[PDB]
Each structure stands twice: as C-alpha cells, then as structure tokens.
Amino acid sequence: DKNIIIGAMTALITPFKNGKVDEQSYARLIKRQIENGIDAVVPVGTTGESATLTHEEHRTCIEIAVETCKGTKVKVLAGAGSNATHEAVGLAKFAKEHGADGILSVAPYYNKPTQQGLYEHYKAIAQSVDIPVLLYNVPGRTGCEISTDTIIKLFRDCENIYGVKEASGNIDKCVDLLAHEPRMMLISGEDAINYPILSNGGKGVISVTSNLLPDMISALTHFALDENYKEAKKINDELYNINKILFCESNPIPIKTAMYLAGLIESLEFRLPLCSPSKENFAKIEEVMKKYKIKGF
Amino acid sequence: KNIIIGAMTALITPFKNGKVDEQSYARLIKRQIENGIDAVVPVGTTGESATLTHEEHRTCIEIAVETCKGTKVKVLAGAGSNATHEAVGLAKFAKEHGADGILSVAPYYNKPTQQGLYEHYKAIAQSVDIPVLLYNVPGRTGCEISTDTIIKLFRDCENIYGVKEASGNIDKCVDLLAHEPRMMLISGEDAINYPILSNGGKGVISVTSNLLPDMISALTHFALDENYKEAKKINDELYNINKILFCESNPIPIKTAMYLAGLIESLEFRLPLCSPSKENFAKIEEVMKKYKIKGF
Amino acid sequence: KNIIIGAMTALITPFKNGKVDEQSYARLIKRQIENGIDAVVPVGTTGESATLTHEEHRTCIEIAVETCKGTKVKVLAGAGSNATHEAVGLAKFAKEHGADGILSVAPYYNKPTQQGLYEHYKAIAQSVDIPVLLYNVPGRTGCEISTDTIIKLFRDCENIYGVKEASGNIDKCVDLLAHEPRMMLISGEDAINYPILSNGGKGVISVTSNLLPDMISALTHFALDENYKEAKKINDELYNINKILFCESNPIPIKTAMYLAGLIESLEFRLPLCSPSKENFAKIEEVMKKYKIKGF
Amino acid sequence: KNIIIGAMTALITPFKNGKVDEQSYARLIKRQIENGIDAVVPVGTTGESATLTHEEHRTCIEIAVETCKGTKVKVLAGAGSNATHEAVGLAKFAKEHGADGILSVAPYYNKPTQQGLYEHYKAIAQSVDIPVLLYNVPGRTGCEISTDTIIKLFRDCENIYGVKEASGNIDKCVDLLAHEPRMMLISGEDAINYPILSNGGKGVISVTSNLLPDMISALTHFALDENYKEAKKINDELYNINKILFCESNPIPIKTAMYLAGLIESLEFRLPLCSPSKENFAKIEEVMKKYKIKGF
Ligand SMILES: N[C@@H](Cc1c[nH]c[nH+]1)C(=O)O
Ligand SMILES: N[C@@H](Cc1c[nH]c[nH+]1)C(=O)O
Ligand SMILES: N[C@@H](Cc1c[nH]c[nH+]1)C(=O)O
Ligand SMILES: N[C@@H](Cc1c[nH]c[nH+]1)C(=O)O
Ligand SMILES: [Mg+2]
Ligand SMILES: [Mg+2]
Ligand SMILES: [Mg+2]
Ligand SMILES: [Mg+2]
Ligand SMILES: [Mg+2]
Ligand SMILES: [Mg+2]
Ligand SMILES: [Mg+2]
Ligand SMILES: [Mg+2]
Ligand SMILES: [Mg+2]
Ligand SMILES: [Mg+2]
Ligand SMILES: [Mg+2]
Ligand SMILES: [Mg+2]
Ligand SMILES: [Mg+2]
Hints:
Four copies of one chain form a homotetramer.
Chain A: E1 7-11, E2 16-17, E3 20-21, H1 23-34, E4 40-42, H2 55-68, E5 75-79, H3 85-97, E6 102-106, H4 115-128, E7 133-137, H5 139-142, H6 148-157, E8 161-166, H7 171-180, E9 185-188, H8 194-199, E10 204-207, H9 214-225, H10 229-245, H11 253-261, H12 279-289
Parallel strand pairs in A: 1-4, 1-10, 4-5, 5-6, 6-7, 7-8, 8-9, 9-10
Antiparallel strand pairs in A: 2-3
PDB class: lyase
Keywords: lyase
Assembly: tetrameric
C-alpha cells in the first residue's frame, strides 16, 4: 500500500568552504554516492548540520540533491524534522515543493513531548504533504523516544508514515517493532549494527559511514536484502572499526574529518558549536581509515 | 562581575486561541514581582521558547522588560540555541531590547564537544555586554557542559558569571563551587533548591515559583541569609508539588496547575506539547490542595 | 577448544515447603531433554543460586548430571562468584560432581577492574579441565567484562570458549565476533535470541525455554542450520512472552508462569525473592494464553 | 530508637601474605578512635567483605569490638547479604559477637522487588535487638531501596533507624527526610558528605576517613553543630581526594593511599580486586600530597 523509500541511504555531510556551502563539492559528493550503488541520499539531516544551516542553504542543498539525482533511480529523502510542529510542517512542505521524494523527520528535541504529543506532532506532519514520511528516533540526541506503540499507531493511522530510522542501540526494540508491525520499514540509524537490524527484517540504512565508503555500505545493505547474510555480516564485521571511530566524537565531526583526510572535501570546516576533533582523535581516524579502500570520484 | 541572582522564575507563556495572551503575560509577571521574586526569565524552556515565533519571542521579552521597569526585578532573557550564530543573534536581541542579562542553554541535539561548547559560549559572551548565565540540562540537550568548561568560561569571559544546573548531580555542584567559589551557581531543579543553596548556590530559576512565588522567594532569601532551618523547611514542604510538577515534561504540569489555580485562562500548549493525561491532570489537582496559592 | 553450545535452559529450582523439590527438578530436566534442548544450566541465576545452601547446590547439579546420563544433553553448571577463591571452589566442585562445563558470572557488587576480571577468570580456568563460559550481565553485577578482556581470556586460557551476553547491546556482540570470530557467543536475553544467533552466535541460555522448550530449541536449531527465516518467526512469536517474563526480576515471572502452567506444584521463592504483584501475576497469565505450553 | 550516627569509617582490611593483618587491623582502628571517629564499620564493602572467609569475618568483628571497649566508639558491623537467611545469620553473628549495630546492604545481583526488600529487611530486623542501618548503593547491587520502602521499614521495625545512601541522588535525600524526618540519613559518598549533612543527615560512613580521619570527623561534627560554613570548607578541601579515592573501584584507591602513607605494610587485595593501574597509582600519590596525613 504505502509509498516507501528504502535500501542503502547516505546521510550527506555538508561541505563548507570559507563559511559557505561548497555547492560543486556537494554535487560532486552526491554523484559519487550514485555511482557506488546508493539507493537514496538524505540532504540537510543531522550529518549535514541542518541545525546550523540557514533557510537558504537548506534549500540549496535539497535542490542540488534533487537535481543531481535526476534521471537515476536514486531518491532524495530530505531532512525536515523540528521540535516545533508548525516548523516541522513548514519544513515538510518545503521539501515537497523543492522536489524531495520523501522526508526524514526527527523526533522533537529538547522540549521532550509526551507520546500523545509525538502522535499529534507527526500526524500534523504526515497530513501536510503527500510524500513518504520516515520517523527518526534518536533519544541520545533528542531527550525523547518515540515508543514502539506510538510508531506503530502512526504507521497505521497516517498514510504517508511508512517506518522509522532507529538510532537507539536497542535491538530489542527493533524486534518489538517488526514482531508487532512487520509491514513497516525499519531503517538502521547506527552503522555498527547495520547487519543485525537488516537480518531481523530491516529494509535499509541511513548511513554515516557511507559518506566515506558508499560501495561497502551499499553492498552490505543489498547483500542483506537479498538474504546473503554471510556476505552482509562479513562487510559489517569489516566495517566495525571505522563504524566506531566515526563516532569517536559527535557525528559529523569524525566523518567530515575522514572525508577531508580522504581528499573528498577541500576544507575541514564546521559550523559552531561543532568544531575540528582533538588532535588525538584526528590521528585515530586517519589510522583507522588506512585499512579501507576509499573510492574516489 | 555583574550578576543576576536570587529567586527567579522561569515564566510560562500563556496562549489564548493559539496566540500569545499578552495581557495575562504581563499580569503574571507582575504577580511575580509582588511576591518577592528577584528576576524573571522570559522565553525559556518553561516558556515554550522552542515553539514561539520571532515576533512572539520579541513580544514576551519586551513585555517582561516593560513590566519590570521601576522595580528591583531583573529580566534574564532566554537566548540559547544549538547554532552559535543563532545564539549570538538571540543574545544581541535581548540586549538591544532592555534585558538585564541572558540565560543561554547548552546546544541541544547536535552534541558539541567541550571545545565546541567553549567556542560557542565565548562567541555569545563577546557579542553583548550584559551578564550571561550558562544553562546545563543534559537530560534535554543530550550534552553536558563539564565542570572544567564552565570554570574556564567563567574565568575567560567577563560576562559569564555562573551556571543554571539542572543535572540532579549535587556532586557536580560541590565540584563547581569548591574549585571556583566565585561563580554564581543557580538551582535549575526545584526539588533540590535548598541543597544547592546550602552548598553556596546564590539563586534559583524556578518552575514552581510560577505557582508559589512567595514560598520560593522566601526559601531562597532564607537560604541566602543562612537561615538554613527555615529554607530547608520550605524546601521539604514544597517537595510534593516540586515532584508532581514534572509528572509530565515541564511545562505541561505547571501550565496545568496555573490553569487549575485560575491564573491563566486556557490550558493551551503549542505542539508537540499538549495537555497532560487525565490521570496526571487529577494528580496535579490533588497535590495542589495542600498548598496556598496566591491570586493576583 | 571444547565447547558447549546450542539451545540451553537456565533451570528454575522448584521449592516445596522451603525445600528443593528434587522430584520436580528431575521431572523438569526430563521435560527439557525431550523437547530438543542441548544443555541445561543448574544452579544459575534463574535457579536462585544466590540463596541455595551448599547441600542444595550439590543436589541440583547431581540431579542434572544424573538425569542427562545416556543423552546428548550437557550439564553447564553455574559456578560464578564475586570472590575468586570461591569461584575456583565452585568450578572444582562442578567438575568433581560430573558437570560437562561451567557458567561463571562476572563478579557482582565488588566491581573489579578489567585486570582483576582477567586474573579472576584465569584462576577459574586453570582450576578445572572442562569448558568455561563467561557470563556478562552488567545490570546485575555492576561490572562489565570488556570485549578486549573477553577476547584476551578466550585466547589465553584453553578452557574459556565464549561468553553469555545479557547486556542489551548488540553492538558489543558485533564487536566480539568481528574481532574474535572463533569464540562462542551465547544469547543471555531471550527477546534478542535471533539477532544474536543471526550475527554468528552459537546458542542461547534461555529463561523462556523453561516454559517453552520446544520453541526455543527449534529457534536455535533453525538459526544454527542457517534457516534464519524460521528462526526469526519463532523469535517474533516469542517476543510477548520473552518480555513479560521480565516484568519483574527473573526468575519471579518464569516461576509464576511455570506454576500457572501446572509444571511446578508451589509458587515458592527463597527470600529476598517473592511472589509477583497481583497485577503482574495477571499480566503473565494473560500473555501465556497465546502460547501452547507442553506438559510432561 | 537506638541509633549509631556521627563520623564513621568503613574500615579497610589489610592483608599480609594473603592473610588478615590482625595487628595492623587493630592499630588502624585505634588510629580512627584517636582522631575523633564515632564508629567503625568492620567487614563492609571497603573491608572487602565479599572475599573474606567466615573465620576472617569473625576475626575482624571481634578485633573491632575488642579495640573499641572502653571508648565512646561503637561498632557497626557489616552484615548484608543477597540471601535473606544468610543476612539473618550475619546479623545474629554480629549481635552475638558484641557489635553495637549492623550495616546491611541491599541484596546484590538477584534484584529483589520492593516487596522482597521489605520482607528481606523485616526478617533481619526481627532476628536481632541492635540497630540496623540500611545501605542503598544501586550502582553496586543492581537494585534500589525505594524511599517508600525505606520509610515503611523505618516505621514498621524498631531496629531499623535509617539508611546509608550511596546513590548520588540528593533529590532522594530530600524525599527521605521531607516525609520521614526522624530517620538517620547517613552519607555513603564522601564527596557529598556536607550536602547530605546540611539537609539533615546525621552522619557519614566514610572511605576517606581511613586516610584522613581527623578531617572527616571535624566535618561531621561541625555540620552536626550547624557550623555549615566550617563543614563546607572541609568538604570543599576534601573534594580532590574524595574523587581520586574512586579513580578505580573502592577500596582499590583507599588501600593504595593507605599503603603510600605507610599506614599498611603491603598493597595486597583479595581477587578479583587487585592493584590499581600505574597511572592511577601515580594520580593517587599526587593528590595525597596536598593533605596532612596523621600517623599512628
Ligand atoms: N537551530 C534550530 C533552528 C534551525 C533549524 N535549522 C536551522 N536552524 C534547530 O536546530 O532546530
Ligand atoms: N525550534 C527551533 C528554532 C526556534 C527557537 N525559537 C523558536 N524557534 C529550536 O528550538 O531551536
Ligand atoms: N549469597 C552469596 C553466597 C552464596 C552463593 N551460593 C549460595 N550462597 C552469593 O550470592 O554470592
Ligand atoms: N562472596 C559471597 C559470599 C560471601 C560473603 N562473605 C564472604 N563470602 C558474597 O559476597 O555474598
Ligand atoms: Mg500498512
Ligand atoms: Mg547467508
Ligand atoms: Mg554521535
Ligand atoms: Mg536559553
Ligand atoms: Mg554463574
Ligand atoms: Mg586442571
Ligand atoms: Mg531480570
Ligand atoms: Mg536475567
Ligand atoms: Mg561499646
Ligand atoms: Mg552490609
Ligand atoms: Mg551526585
Ligand atoms: Mg539525633
Ligand atoms: Mg557542639
């Protein structure tokens, strides 16, 4: 029934050069994702530092993502969450009027809505557009969790809501979700446990690691979707070291560092309050990167 | 250092037909003035800061500033953000609009490092010339301002004069005031108002004081005069309401209580915040019965 | 390495009038063997090991050893303790009384360091010549056996062949098997039996199998045979019972369920364990109605 | 109610060639007596209770009881267990051997329910006629004694006169004394000794007092006399050592410090406890240099 966006997906970093969005590098990075088997890209999400982007930069990165993926099978799942419902509705409509195929909408952060409030929050979002809406649960960042019951109720009550991106380190909850609502699309939000989530019936990943190693995250996901769990687990095991080191500090500090170390972006620039990693963690990321075959452009 | 301390209220923002009830806002703030409160915090967490428009945000700061003119009560305006350039803009805004200082919560959701938190607050502190109070609430932000970072910011930036602590960590409050006794430690958790003050805390930014400003004001001023027996006795008496006011996420219970007390006209929130459950509504009403609530 | 893997049951210890019901104990083990179980764990956490006398500990190990003679079912005896010299004595005891291997939980309460945990288990491993399975359950012990410590112990001590994981941390299970794929990772949490097995885990030590031995043994054997579809569907039906069996601290719900199913005569615990609340008693009864419980 | 309050020391248990140094044990207790300590706690957590033999347990209680005869110092013997019948035996043991009261930690590892904790402690309290102090340390036991359970036990059983809290939860300490101000709240965390005392706590059971008994004793008695300025100044002064004494799991740092101060002859632990890392050894030595350490 439901319109879905699944498979291997990349939470795109937003490269900056002299405090401005590096627009051809942004486009150059997405084409690199397309050519390495990625099924969808997520502009202006957490890994893209949406929280510090201006309104316009937000529009520029969605429009570049939409245009770069034209004429390919690669979908654009635009970041559109906010802790204010009227703001999240505006972001959802914004992503729709600018050509996104669907939206990722993170649970409200900081203001800790109740489960009832989360239901009304997402119901208002789902009714505002006619494109797929993927919930994003990351309690370590938001201070709140969308309960299994709330996710399932939203999936059943609102046409557009087709699943949830899980970044809670709780494989029990992933069993809980798919055992009581097996029709939903559970999406891995934690690279280290990509395979365990997929092997339980998860239908995709929204990846940080795929920024650096899109081919490996792509192959992992597609192996698992084709039920080649031995080959999916083998990439997951090989990726564990980089999957962990990419969170030595808060994402996207390590991944942007690695992208810079790989020569895939020109400057190691963040928007405050994000900043360069410690020099110790800088060295750790560079060291761990050395075992992986990093595709160029 | 210029400071803003004493008994302070995290002001609720009353809504009427989904729009800011400006007259009730002013009436609630003066009600605070008349009950011994030393400072008010407009457009903070308890004020549903996150969901207000730019104009509403301006309207409530301006009302607060205006209502406090001609009194000793200071306006400590909410100005935090998880984007440094946004927080700098909010800081400048509050300054330009007559606020006596700013409360600026640690960046939420994007989890900056300690180094990033330092640069975040340094940029905010250099952007204005009014006192800046840090706000640490890791349960809401996903982030913590370490003791070392707080102390470094206090020592390096003239405007940063202390921290509002909402971490349930009296150990950290000992850590803070034992290594930097000059800072102003402000209670951000009503239930442990007295323990924080008794260790050298110099004020509270209270949720409960919305409902019981006279008791929170007396508690704080007793404690500041080292009348610890009387401060602790008010803290002990207030425990039941202090807990029930977080039966659901603040400000859902306090707005419910303010509505039950007839102090605001509508039990209206801005989504994703909403009315409490029917059971918690009744629990709040039940606990309120043991307290004497001042009218207008 | 000698290993003990597959579908395993953490045996409850039935009491009658404050005494170990030896007949029931043998009959329950009898029942597990007949439903495809590969090994039984006497005198573990689910068996209320902490409150058994020396005599009772001995009794239940010997009954387990006796009941599994002439079958393929191994006896993996509980032998952990937070005192190394006591754990060595328990390990030697289990070997002297016919156990095929030992489960040895990480020291509880005294929170040893990783270095101490390494020395603790090396002393245990050198004390016997039978396989040793580590048991990590930080929610109960207050300590964690780190991945590095587990891997070092697996490589440095012949008898140590894997770890029972009860940490709600599938990341650690990836960590373990990605860096030491030769070890035997055993599920200690029934609800996530399949995810652990599907990542290369080689068995479960189950609470649910006390009640539903046929379903837990089929799940494990399906997964071990790389029939992950059939393993996952049994894991999915078992979720409701897997969760309700921990509505209160194990083994309070499983003994309640065993009593409700008529598999044990009395709902008796040894203090400080006790009957569940009346609400949770009814909840366990309600969840059981969807399942087909095998009798004797 | 009969109570045991004031400044109290959780005694380390010195070992020499794997055996309890009985002479050193007595000499250490006499040092505590001579430095203002009001009570000593033999065979507790800091004394490595979990790894002592029956004989050693009794030897250390008898040495403590004998050494404190003719002094104002009471013996609050460790007597907790996670098995109620074992804890009852330990309670009767301490009473029959001259202890003035017992400390009884919440059952560890097996996670009893609040109902089970109530029945656990009621049986212990009925078994003896000397004061019983509860010990809540959820980070070690995996369980918490709720405020309601503590208050119920205090009200229903004569011997239960308070609780030793090691939960880093000053909110709970407000909760306890706001609803039951007659109980004796005892600090189980040295860093927050003063905040607990200034809220109405009536004593400490201290790790730091092993090394600095005069300073912990002065802190407590200043606080008990409502000299909070002087009590807080010692608490602030002690923060660095109070923190470093848990760089690793207690009693690893305190025994290291006692050995570095020449107060015990060998840095020996019973496994799974062990010497600290070389880094933390040096850190402990560094922080110790800022303090005046009394000899014998
Ligand atoms: N910084 C605010 C507002 C914002 C969103 N995107 C850009 N700015 C937030 O994270 O919600
Ligand atoms: N909702 C966003 C932006 C905002 C602040 N105030 C109003 N809107 C935040 O909480 O940061
Ligand atoms: N109750 C103690 C001692 C014991 C073990 N088995 C029986 N008693 C423990 O759990 O370690
Ligand atoms: N080690 C077990 C048994 C014991 C207690 N005291 C000495 N041994 C426990 O801590 O409960
Ligand atoms: Mg459907
Ligand atoms: Mg396969
Ligand atoms: Mg992160
Ligand atoms: Mg703020
Ligand atoms: Mg064991
Ligand atoms: Mg041998
Ligand atoms: Mg349990
Ligand atoms: Mg268990
Ligand atoms: Mg005496
Ligand atoms: Mg004890
Ligand atoms: Mg604390
Ligand atoms: Mg008294
Ligand atoms: Mg006096």
